[PDB]
């Protein structure tokens, strides 16, 4: 391979063997320098693919997917408020049908990108779809599968105390800070009709594990295939329907695809065309801190039965009389009476005209279209009008009821995306002597557009009905559109010498819409070398290859980042907004992000060198790459002192750097005609470092964070993703300071840097057995390093449910290194502490994070996982023969089967987020639904 940077090719068979709805999730831990995480285990969700770390401080770091080989739309659809209404609906590449994948090839370097443009800076996932035959006999391949999912990891709970606060008993608590379990009959919950439920005060450990069912999902695939000496035709249809382990149909994903791809050669001239249609309907059991389903589930005392709260003829479960009023509702109700739906119709495809002429030349024209409509319909009942008066939840809770002012809301949004891409190329390929010159010169044109229409309606008249006319109060209406365009010209020169020295030289030049008129043009060259020794007695070294490449790759800004705009006047206030018009007056404000027509194109320089060797007839094999990736002058909306009149300014950041080692090992310790055993060990170690952010705006900028709480940044001397949290004060050396009177730790002056987001190293191992027609595959995914915010740990600490909180058998205690600080004027003196945290105040010692305080809730990102297990029995051809089958392969598999995590983490599967599949998702998990354990069957029938 003349390629002089790292890359990896995966066969369609390995992609679809894992039988995932999705093309990338099965490659989760199997490819070095390609970090593949799923945002959650909700059906239909996004998937994250970052290669050689985050280069783009905000907020685009997926690789350019490229199907045939047309750029594919990879946009993502998730909630702009992960704190209160969190939901994730899809990734662009979730549409591609894994049974139509023939070869994936993940380009990783940013040095030879002229063919695939600027978006390649983040890697390219070159996909190439199946085609023609001939083959015995008629062309049909049928795949139909069936899988279940099961909850994988719930937080480790405690079963020593029950419902209560301050340590005392309580009938209505949303938490477990009560007396020790007696077994003694006690009351709980509200009083209805002068009666009340009375039950043994005993723990129930399974009471959450029991809430969940087993998600089910059925899959059906069909393909039709054939060919001649001048043509080929593939026609395919995939179908999926998923109903996850959360109860009800609230966790739904339906996927349908239909694709027709065909080629024909007469000439000289070849013409082919791919056309595809993709449907999906999602329903997301929303997460958040409000009346959502999970946050309502964790806030459950350890003695309360959750599967008993479902029946709604037991008046104690109807919204009015549910056992707790503390910002929480019956989960079964939230899933049954709320709406969060997403539907999508997509059309994308390509046309390609290849015409060979004059012995050595080839003309190729390629146009791609990818256009989408999607429609969200979220809504929630008028909880107030239906349940406030009368119920103790209710009038009885005054200003503080869960139903105020939950007066009902319904919105609807229709989103339209369209991008057309044009490639016009003329290749050249002649051999002279032992040399071989191939050159390629082309033109690329690209236009991308997105727009959406939104209407929302509040305070619903008929409480249940979700319709843009069931309201007496003014509707809210929003409308947006974006348009970018890019033209470019590129040449790629391939040198060669007798199949031994390959040299490549690419150069591209783009003119982008998103950069200031006066500075639209940026040029980036690239040089690649490849040296096979090997070609220089021993049948011991199958293959050897040494690689080097130095290249650049520019980028442009996001849209509309040059001119200052005036917006319609609105002000953000905590948990609200005060938006114009009022009253009868409309008004505009000066936009809070200063624009800049002094910008210059972004530039990524890479230096990469690698080595590849194979031994003993491809029975021991290893590939190693080292990379040094810089990314300078990235356009970013850098933070700024608001007193300047603006809240941020668009300017050119400094270098974001990723260096690291990408290494793959693979050997076949056994081989016969009847049994093979392969091993594989891949290892990735990356070093991420923000090198500088413009000095004059201070040093740092926020990437995501709570107001006065744990927030992740991008600081000048540090990695991408340095957290800060409230750490506890400590004296001149020791020495937790606590309050003289409560006993509780004492916040320090500043927050404290508490880790970055990055795994220190990631690696994966894999084994593959074959015995006659039997296959067995196992894969493990190892990541260690880094850290993430976890509201899962946060709410199980606040609630007193998490195992860690039975710390001192919940007897009064003195923080074991505590010290009071004695300040008089400016005299500072430290004294052994003598004040305990009392029983009544144990709840607060944990509620705020223990002696760690806030920072307690940055969880050790690290995990080890049993990624997948795939057993496959290829029936032997003699078996069938009296049947119309050309092949049968029964298959049984499991995914995300088991997670291991380091002691301090007994809360989550770290592979979670409530903030999307890119950079900001690294901030953490905001009570995302639990991850799940998937397993099932799949039958293949070739005709």
């Amino acid at each position: 391979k003349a390629l002089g940077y790292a890359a990896t090719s995966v066969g369609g068979e390995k992609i679809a063997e894992s039988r995932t709805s999705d093309v990338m999730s099965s490659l989760a831990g199997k490819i070095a320098g390609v970090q593949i995480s799923s945002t959650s285990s909700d059906p239909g969700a996004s998937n994250s693919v970052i290669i050689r770390g985050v280069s783009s401080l905000s907020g685009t770091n997926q690789p350019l997917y490229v199907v045939d080989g047309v750029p594919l739309n990879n946009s993502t659809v998730y909630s702009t408020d992960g704190l209160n209404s969190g939901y994730d609906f899809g990734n662009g590449a979730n549409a591609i049908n894994p049974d139509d994948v023939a070869n994936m090839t993940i380009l990783k370097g940013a040095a030879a990108t002229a063919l695939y443009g600027s978006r390649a800076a983040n890697g390219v996932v070159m996909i190439t779809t199946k085609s023609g035959r001939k083959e015995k006999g008629v062309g049909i391949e049928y795949n139909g599968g069936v899988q279940w999912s099961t909850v994988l990891r719930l937080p480790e709970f405690q079963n020593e105390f029950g419902m209560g606060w301050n340590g005392n008993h309580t009938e209505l608590e949303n938490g477990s800070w009560g007396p020790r379990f007696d077994g003694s009959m006690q009351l709980w919950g509200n009083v209805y009709n002068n009666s009340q439920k009375l039950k043994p005060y005993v723990a129930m450990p399974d009471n959450i594990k029991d809430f969940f069912d087993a998600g089910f999902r059925y899959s059906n695939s069909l393909s039709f295939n054939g060919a001649t000496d001048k043509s080929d035709y593939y026609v395919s249809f995939s179908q999926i329907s998923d109903d996850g382990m959360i109860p009800t149909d609230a966790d739904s994903y339906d996927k349908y695809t239909f694709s027709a791809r065909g080629s024909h050669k007469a000439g000289a001239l070849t013409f082919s065309s791919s056309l595809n249609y993709a449907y999906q309907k999602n329903n997301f059991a929303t997460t958040g801190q409000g009346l959502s389903m999970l946050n309502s589930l964790y806030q459950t005392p350890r003695d309360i039965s959750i599967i008993g709260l479902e029946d709604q003829n037991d008046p104690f479960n109807t919204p009015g009389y549910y056992y707790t009023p503390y910002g929480v509702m019956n989960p079964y109700y939230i899933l049954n009476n709320y709406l969060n739906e997403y539907e999508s119709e997509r059309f994308y495809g390509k046309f390609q005209l290849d015409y060979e002429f004059l012995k050595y030349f080839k003309f190729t024209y390629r146009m791609g279209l990818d256009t989408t409509t999607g429609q969200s319909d979220k809504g929630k009942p008028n909880l107030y009008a239906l349940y406030y008066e009368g119920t103790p939840n209710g009038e009885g809770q005054g200003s503080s009821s869960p139903f105020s002012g939950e007066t009902g809301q319904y919105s609807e949004q229709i989103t339209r995306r369209r991008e057309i891409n044009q490639d016009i190329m003329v290749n050249f390929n002649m051999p002279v002597n032992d040399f071989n010159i191939n050159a390629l010169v082309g033109f690329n044109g690209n236009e991308r557009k997105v727009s959406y229409q939104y209407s929302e309606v509040n305070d619903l008249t008929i409480p249940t009905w979700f319709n843009l006319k069931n309201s007496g109060k003014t509707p809210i209406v929003e409308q947006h559109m974006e348009l970018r365009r890019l033209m470019g010209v590129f040449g790629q020169f391939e040198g060669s010498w007798k199949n031994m020295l390959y040299l490549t030289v690419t150069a591209r030049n783009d003119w982008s819409s998103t950069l200031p008129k006066e500075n639209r043009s940026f040029f980036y060259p690239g040089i690649t070398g490849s040296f096979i020794f090997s070609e220089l007695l021993q049948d011991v070294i199958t293959f050897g290859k040494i690689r080097a490449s130095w290249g650049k790759t520019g980028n442009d800004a996001d849209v509309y980042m040059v001119n200052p705009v005036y917006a319609q006047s609105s002000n953000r206030i905590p948990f609200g907004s005060l938006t114009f018009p009022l009253g009868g007056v409309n008004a505009y404000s000066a936009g809070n992000v200063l624009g800049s027509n002094t910008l210059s194109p972004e530039m990524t320089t890479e230096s990469e060198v690698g080595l590849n060797m194979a031994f003993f007839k491809n029975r021991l094999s290893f590939d190693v790459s080292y990379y040094n990736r810089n990314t300078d002058k990235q356009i970013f909306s850098l933070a700024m002192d608001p007193a300047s009149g603006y809240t941020a300014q668009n300017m050119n950041l400094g270098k974001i750097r990723n260096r690291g080692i990408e290494l793959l090992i693979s050997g076949t310790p056994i081989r016969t005609k009847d049994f093979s055993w392969e091993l594989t060990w891949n290892f990735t170690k990356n070093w991420s470092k923000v090198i500088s952010l413009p000095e004059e705006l201070g040093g740092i900028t926020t990437i995501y964070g709570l107001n006065g709480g744990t927030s992740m940044y991008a600081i000048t001397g540090m990695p991408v993703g340095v957290f800060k949290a409230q750490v506890a004060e400590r004296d001149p050396q020791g020495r937790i300071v606590v309050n003289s009177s409560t006993g509780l730790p004492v916040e320090a002056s500043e927050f404290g840097i508490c880790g970055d987001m990055n795994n220190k190293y990631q690696m994966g191992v894999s084994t593959n057995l074959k015995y006659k027609g039997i296959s067995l595959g196992i894969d493990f995914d190892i990541r260690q390093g880094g850290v993430m915010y976890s509201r899962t740990k946060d709410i199980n600490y606040f609630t007193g449910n998490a195992i860690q909180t039975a710390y001192n058998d919940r007897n009064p205690l003195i923080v074991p290194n505590s010290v009071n600080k004695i300040v008089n004027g400016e005299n500072v003196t430290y004294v052994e502490n003598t004040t305990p945290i009392t029983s009544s105040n144990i709840y607060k010692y944990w509620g705020d994070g223990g002696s760690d305080m806030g920072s307690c809730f940055l969880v050790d990102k690290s995990y080890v996982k049993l990624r997948s297990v795939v057993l496959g029995w290829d029936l032997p051809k003699r078996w069938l023969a009296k049947t119309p089958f050309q092949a049968v392969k029964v298959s049984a598999y499991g995914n995300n089967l088991f997670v291991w995590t380091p002691s301090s983490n007994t809360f989550i599967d770290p592979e979670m987020t409530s903030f999307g599949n890119d950079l900001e998702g690294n901030y953490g998990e905001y009570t995302a639904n639990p991850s799940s354990r998937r397993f099932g069957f799949n039958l293949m029938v070739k005709f």
């Binding site: 704190l83 801190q289 709480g709 606040f798």
Partner: peptide
């Protein structure tokens, strides 16, 4: 510029 959580009841 940030985002507010809320505490709970108890």
């Amino acid at each position: 510029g940030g985002g507010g959580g809320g505490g709970g009841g108890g």
